[PDB]
């Protein structure tokens, strides 16, 4: 696969998408510096519309923990009916 191919499902929990993005990026053949740039751009870029809105709002200084918290329940809540 390619990191370029990883995108958040329409209703996928942000936490699940980040996990998939990380797993793919670990395997990607690129420089560390490039992997940093990929994370800094593609993770938010390829989030679904509803998460993407939240992530942009949080700003570039946000931590992963903060992103996770802000996107909790978007697409969800995902409990059995």
């Amino acid at each position: 696969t390619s990191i370029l191919d990883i995108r958040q499902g329409p209703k996928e929990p942000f936490r699940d998408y980040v996990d998939r993005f990380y797993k793919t990026l670990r395997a990607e053949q690129a420089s560390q510096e490039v992997k940093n740039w990929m994370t800094a751009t593609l993770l938010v870029q390829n989030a679904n519309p509803d998460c993407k809105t939240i992530l942009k709002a949080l700003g570039p200084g946000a931590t992963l923990e903060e992103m996770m918290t802000a996107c909790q329940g978007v697409g969800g809540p995902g409990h059995k009916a």
């Binding site: 980040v18 996990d19 993005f21 990380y22 990026l25 560390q32 992997k35 940093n36 990929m38 994370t39 800094a40 993770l43 946000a62 931590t63 992963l64 923990e65 992103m67």
Partner: peptide
């Protein structure tokens, strides 16, 4: 965030 943040989070 950077790849290093991912490594820290999941590592």
């Amino acid at each position: 965030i950077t790849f290093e943040d991912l490594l820290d989070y999941y590592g």
